[PDB]
Design an enzyme around this catalytic site. Structure first.
Site, PDB file in Angstrom:
ATOM      1  N   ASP A  61      -8.545  10.512  -6.437  1.00  0.00           N
ATOM      2  CA  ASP A  61      -8.000  11.233  -7.898  1.00  0.00           C
ATOM      3  C   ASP A  61      -6.591  11.393  -7.426  1.00  0.00           C
ATOM      4  O   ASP A  61      -6.422  12.437  -6.892  1.00  0.00           O
ATOM      5  CB  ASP A  61      -8.151  11.762  -8.718  1.00  0.00           C
ATOM      6  N   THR A  62      -6.126  10.337  -8.057  1.00  0.00           N
ATOM      7  CA  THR A  62      -4.299  11.505  -7.427  1.00  0.00           C
ATOM      8  C   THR A  62      -3.627  11.321  -8.545  1.00  0.00           C
ATOM      9  O   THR A  62      -3.961  11.635  -9.468  1.00  0.00           O
ATOM     10  CB  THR A  62      -3.286  10.235  -6.622  1.00  0.00           C
TER      11      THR A  62
ATOM     12  N   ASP B   5      -2.977   5.571  -6.268  1.00  0.00           N
ATOM     13  CA  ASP B   5      -4.769   5.007  -6.795  1.00  0.00           C
ATOM     14  C   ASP B   5      -4.450   3.748  -6.677  1.00  0.00           C
ATOM     15  O   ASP B   5      -5.343   3.045  -6.783  1.00  0.00           O
ATOM     16  CB  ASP B   5      -5.033   6.221  -8.291  1.00  0.00           C
TER      17      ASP B   5
ATOM     18  N   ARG C 163     -10.536  -4.253 -12.235  1.00  0.00           N
ATOM     19  CA  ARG C 163     -10.019  -3.588 -10.467  1.00  0.00           C
ATOM     20  C   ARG C 163     -10.835  -3.792  -9.757  1.00  0.00           C
ATOM     21  O   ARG C 163     -11.875  -3.233  -9.898  1.00  0.00           O
ATOM     22  CB  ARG C 163      -9.667  -2.440 -10.923  1.00  0.00           C
TER      23      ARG C 163
ATOM     24  N   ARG D  11      -7.974  -0.523  -7.515  1.00  0.00           N
ATOM     25  CA  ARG D  11      -8.292   1.091  -6.866  1.00  0.00           C
ATOM     26  C   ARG D  11      -8.470   1.763  -6.348  1.00  0.00           C
ATOM     27  O   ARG D  11      -9.412   0.682  -6.008  1.00  0.00           O
ATOM     28  CB  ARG D  11      -9.030   1.489  -8.439  1.00  0.00           C
TER      29      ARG D  11
ATOM     30  N   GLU E  23      -1.089  10.773 -11.317  1.00  0.00           N
ATOM     31  CA  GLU E  23      -0.541   9.999 -11.591  1.00  0.00           C
ATOM     32  C   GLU E  23       0.839  10.282 -12.396  1.00  0.00           C
ATOM     33  O   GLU E  23       1.160  10.946 -12.396  1.00  0.00           O
ATOM     34  CB  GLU E  23      -1.159   9.372 -12.166  1.00  0.00           C
TER      35      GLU E  23
END
EC number: 3.1.31.1
Length: 135
Positions: free
Chosen positions: A34-35, A15, A81, A29, A37
């Site tokens: 949402d991956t 991400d 970000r 970002r 992590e």
């Protein structure tokens, strides 16, 4: 929304990627996904984390052209970000992750939700096809 060119510096996670934008080094970002992590000891290397991370890396690393597309709300988050849709040779990395079952559609905050319907559609497909995260 318009796209703008950028240059890869380094992929950091599923991400997050570091790009050269408007001549400045910046961490980005990926908007609305949402991956799993590989970051956070408050976690660690969650399941499909290495996978989501290699997916983003390969895709961005192997591209001719990278483009960033800001949404219509705030363009940076509380950590500094950039918040954007990232395209590799015309393909949105955020949608690709979700299409492959390697990302969930994140909690959405208006007005930063322009591609939300699109992504949700891909997410529903990925679920239907029982890919990765959905298997």
């Amino acid at each position: 929304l318009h796209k703008e060119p950028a240059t890869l510096i380094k992929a950091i996670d599923g991400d997050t990627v570091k790009l050269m934008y408007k001549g400045q080094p910046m961490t980005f970002r990926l908007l609305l996904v949402d991956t799993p992590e590989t970051k956070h000891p408050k976690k660690g290397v969650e399941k499909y984390g290495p996978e989501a991370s290699a997916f983003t890396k390969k895709m961005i690393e192997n591209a001719k052209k990278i483009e960033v597309e800001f949404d219509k709300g705030q363009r940076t988050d509380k950590y500094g970000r950039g918040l954007a849709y990232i395209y590799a040779d015309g393909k949105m990395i955020n949608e690709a992750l979700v299409r492959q079952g390697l990302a969930k559609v994140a909690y959405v905050y208006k007005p930063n939700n322009t591609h939300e319907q699109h992504l949700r559609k891909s997410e529903a497909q990925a679920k239907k096809e029982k890919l990765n995260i959905w298997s």
